[PDB]
Amino acid sequence: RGRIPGRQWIGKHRRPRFVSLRAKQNMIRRLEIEAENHYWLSMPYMTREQERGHAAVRRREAFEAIKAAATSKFPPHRFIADQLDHLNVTKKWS
C-alpha cells in the first residue's frame, strides 16, 4: 500500500535506513582499535632532530642501481646457432 517515490536511496523523500546492534558493536570495536593505534602512535624515538641523514646512503645506492638498470636497456644478442639449427625442420633419419 505504501509507495516509495523515485529511488529509495537518492532524492528528497527516501526510505530511511537505521542502525541495529551488529553495526554498533562493529563501530565500538573499530573505535577501540583506532584508540589503541593513537596510543601506540604517541611516542617517537629520534624526535626528528636526530635523523638528518642516517639512511640516505642506502637510498642513494638504490637510486644509482635503479638508474644503472634503467639505462642498460638494449636489444638481446643475435647468434648464428639459431639460424643454423632452424634447418632441422626437414630432418630425416640421419
Binding site: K12, V19, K24
Partner: peptide
C-alpha cells in the same frame, strides 16, 4: 540535490546516522 538548510528535516547520511546512534548519552 538539496541545500544545506531545509524544512523537511532531511535524513542524514548512513555513516553520520550510525555515528550519531553509537555516540548517544
Amino acid at each position: 540535490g538539496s541545500k544545506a538548510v531545509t524544512r523537511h528535516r532531511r535524513v542524514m547520511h548512513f555513516q553520520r546516522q550510525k555515528l550519531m546512534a553509537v555516540t548517544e548519552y
